[PDB]
Design a protein around this ligand. Structure first.
Ligand SMILES: [Mg+2]
Lengths: 116, 64, 199, 144
RNA sequence: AAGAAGCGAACGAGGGGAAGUGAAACAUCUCAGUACCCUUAGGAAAAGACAUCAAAUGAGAUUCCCCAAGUAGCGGCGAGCGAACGGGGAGAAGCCGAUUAAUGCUAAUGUAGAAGAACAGCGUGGGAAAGCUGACCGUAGUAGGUGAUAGUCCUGUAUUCGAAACAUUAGCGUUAACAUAUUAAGUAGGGCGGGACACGAGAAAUCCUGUCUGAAGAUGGGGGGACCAUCCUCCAAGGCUAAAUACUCCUGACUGACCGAUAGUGAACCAGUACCGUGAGGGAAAGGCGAAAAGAACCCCUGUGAGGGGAGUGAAAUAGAACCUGAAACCGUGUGCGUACAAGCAGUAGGAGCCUCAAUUUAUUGGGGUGACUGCGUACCUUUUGUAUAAUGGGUCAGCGACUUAUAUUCUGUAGCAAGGUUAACCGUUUAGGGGAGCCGUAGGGAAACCGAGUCUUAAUAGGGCGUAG
């Protein structure tokens, strides 16, 4: 019962080369190089699923700091004032309000500043 | 037909008992003046093969 | 136990030979052993020893810049021997006598239980003629059938030879795979008695 | 009695074999369970029986003892519970042979108290132990 | 006058006879009486009828198979080597001419051959064997073909069958060549050195013989594993003998959970070729148009070239002869987007703009391509305490490339039977049925005799050791 490897080997290599579409040079063309580039891409993507949650909180905090300093407060006093006022609005939503609704963010700063 | 060969020299040293193997003890062949009579008494007779050694004994004497 | 022929005559068969509870694992082992006993097992490949040539070292060990080689018929090379080249094998199994008998018992009981066994008083074709057996099997409503009779007649055999999904067997040459493979089994009462005695 | 299409061996009947060196996911890739490069990882490697690495082995530390008796090779011990294989009431060495209780080249037989005897026998040319003898005549047989 | 010679598979018998290896070194030993060299047969060979075993109530030549048994033994008692008795089978046979070669009858075979059933319509289709409908043959229905898949189209198959000539096999008859012992002395036995016995000098029987010797001869001799006695057994020093057993250069039929062009023979092809080597010798690569050549008349460009474009053929011509399919590496052309102020495993997570398809009552979403800009981010394997490592390996792709097979053994699961389980070789009109020899379990203790739920040690009945569901 002799088994030829041609058809399965072909479809196996085509899966990897398909995942390597758009890569430079040998990285999208030749299997020995494509298979390393796909594995490294998956490794980076796994690490960056974690890191993106850090990067976006970084961004929200920056925008909230700018919004609060426009209203006369720093981030570390504004967040303390929210926690003292029992306001549960998350940083994602607070940054959205600071960016797209300046009067509402002014009202939130007023509440935090009255709490201090 | 090919069969496992017994270690014929191990068969001459080990014998089958109900739950193990029996053996004679060493240090009784010669040099026996200097040995105490307690050692001459207690080195005489059968010991049991140690539990750590009975795997090797089974590998060596597969038909006993 | 208590069965009827196609005509209506009552026949009493033993429960040990025709009523034993189905053991699918035992039936599987016996059927699979029967199948493995059909294998011829006649093949071979060549090892590096038995491929033509290959006696000299292809180049010297050091200094050529090449991976070291011992033979041009190594299994690594194109045209080399097979590492673990196959040789002829014996695929027959030892099936216990009682396991074979119990599997035949199980098979016969299961055939009765799913109504694939048909008892007839006799099945005698009077002329070595295929159409006669085709008519006799169409009235029995088993066009695709294994006809088990003691002392298979030397013109019923001829009448059955050319019918596609029909085989005629004597009770000594019945096998489990034959009993399982055909849509119906037409057993004479004499052959049912022989099966009672054998099993 | 099913189809050839639908017989199964049953759970636990079949186990798939291990194939060494078929990738990472199999748990047996690369070295195939042999570990790393020593004598045991090499091809024709064995576990040499009775070899302790050069230390004199146990069977050569210890003395040979005993001699082998030819008389014991032809003496067969017979249990009381094997006697249901005997045809008739007489129990002799020939009768034990034809019952296949003892090998056909056994010269002597000894009947020992292992099981129980269900009928009365007449033991002719065999040795019978004390408990075996009492059990035999409790079942109603005799020893001669 | 008759023969021989030489060549050529394997298997037989015989004369010589390694080493690598194993012993974790190595010399005894192993490998192994193997490889190889040499001699010489036959369809087989050899052996074979007791100067054999046994020690049982004895059996009754040789050979081969299954057990006995990895037992008894042998063994630097290491590594290893490894019986026999006997049991169960196959086959059987005993003779003194169981020879060889012809020829002649009678029979049979083989080497060419002969006949050999039964299907149409309709639709699709290049083509029908496939579809739908309805028939027929079958002692012939899973054969190979035929323009796609055919019991009924062809060759076949079932069945029945032929021989002028020659071969072969038997039976018979006859011839002509050779052979036809008459009971066994340089023999048995012995000393010395070797060899073979499973047995390595061993307490070493038995066999063989280079050397030196050397009987008795039936009122005798050989064997029974040193040896002696007794008992049993058998008569060497004459020859022969079928089968059961070994093999395959070949012939025929048949088969395959064997391969399918890097496989399978080295060799599917003008292969033991090309090629390499003084030579012995080594030793490739290389299959496929189409159903049918219908293999492209003729025209045009070109050098009467190559190559192409039309025309034509064809179902199909990116099926056009380097011809089925036609992957990848690799190399072009075209379109969209990006890219010439910016530093690194080239991705990833985000993200503007552009391009393109769709919706959507109309620049918003959704899909696709691209990716300015930001964060993070030193390949893979191996080997290591530890590798981005300036340590190893890989130019790339495709194809191939490494835990097998046989037997023994132990444990686990599962199935059947269960204090029992199971047969082996064989036979078998063969996976059945038969075959119980044997093996394992059912008892152990002890070196053993021996005893036995006990036994061993001991003066001890004490103590202690080991023992008290397959
Ligand atoms: Mg092509």
């Amino acid at each position: 019962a002799r088994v030829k490897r041609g058809v399965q080997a072909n479809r196996r290599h085509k899966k990897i080369l398909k995942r390597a579409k758009g890569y430079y040079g040998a990285r999208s063309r030749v299997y020995r190089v494509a298979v390393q580039a796909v594995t490294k891409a998956g490794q980076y993507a796994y690490r960056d699923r974690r890191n993106k949650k850090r990067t976006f909180r970084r961004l929200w905090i920056a925008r909230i700091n700018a919004g609060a300093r426009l209203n006369g407060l720093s981030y570390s006093r504004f967040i303390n004032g929210m926690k003292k006022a029992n306001i549960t609005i998350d940083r994602r939503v607070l940054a959205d309000i600071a960016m797209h609704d300046a009067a509402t963010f002014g009202a939130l700063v007023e509440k935090a500043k009255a709490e201090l | 037909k090919v069969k496992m060969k017994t270690k014929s020299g191990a068969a001459k040293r080990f014998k089958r008992t109900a739950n193990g193997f029996k053996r004679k003890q060493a240090f009784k062949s010669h040099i026996l003046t200097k040995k105490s009579s307690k050692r001459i008494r207690q080195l005489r007779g059968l010991k049991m093969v140690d539990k750590s050694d009975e795997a090797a004994v089974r590998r060596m004497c597969p038909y006993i | 136990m208590d069965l009827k022929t196609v005509t209506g005559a009552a026949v009493e068969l033993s429960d040990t030979a025709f009523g034993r509870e189905f053991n699918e694992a035992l039936v599987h082992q016996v059927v699979t052993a029967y199948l493995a006993g059909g294998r011829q097992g006649t093949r071979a490949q060549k090892t590096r020893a038995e491929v033509s040539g290959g006696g000299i070292k292809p180049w010297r060990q050091k200094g050529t810049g090449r991976a070291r080689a011992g033979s041009i018929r190594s299994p690594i090379w194109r045209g080399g021997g097979r590492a673990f080249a196959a040789k002829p094998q014996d695929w027959s199994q030892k099936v216990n006598r009682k396991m074979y008998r119990g599997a035949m018992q199980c098979i016969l009981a299961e055939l009765i239980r799913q109504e694939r066994l048909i008892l007839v008083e006799e099945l005698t074709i009077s002329a070595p003629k295929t159409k006669e057996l085709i008519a006799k099997l169409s009235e029995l409503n088993a066009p695709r059938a294994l006809i088990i009779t003691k002392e298979v007649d030397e013109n019923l055999y001829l009448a059955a030879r050319n019918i596609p999904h029909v085989n005629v067997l004597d009770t000594s040459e019945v096998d489990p795979v034959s009993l399982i493979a055909f849509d119906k089994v037409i057993m004479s009462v004499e052959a049912a008695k022989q099966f009672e005695e054998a099993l | 009695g099913l189809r050839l299409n639908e017989l199964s061996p049953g759970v636990g009947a079949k186990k798939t074999a291990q194939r060494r060196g078929r990738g990472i996911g199999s748990g047996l890739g690369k070295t195939g369970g042999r570990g790393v490069k020593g004598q045991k990882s090499r091809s024709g490697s064995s576990i040499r029986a009775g070899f302790e690495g050069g230390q004199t082995p146990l069977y050569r530390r210890l003395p040979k003892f005993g001699f082998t008796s030819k008389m014991a090779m032809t003496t067969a011990e017979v249990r009381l519970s094997e006697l249901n294989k005997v045809e008739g009431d007489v129990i002799s060495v020939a009768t034990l042979k034809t019952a296949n209780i003892i090998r056909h080249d056994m010269k002597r037989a000894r009947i020992i108290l292992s099981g129980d005897v269900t009928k009365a026998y007449t033991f002719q040319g065999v040795k019978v132990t004390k408990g075996a003898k009492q059990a035999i005549e409790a079942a109603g047989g005799s020893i001669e």
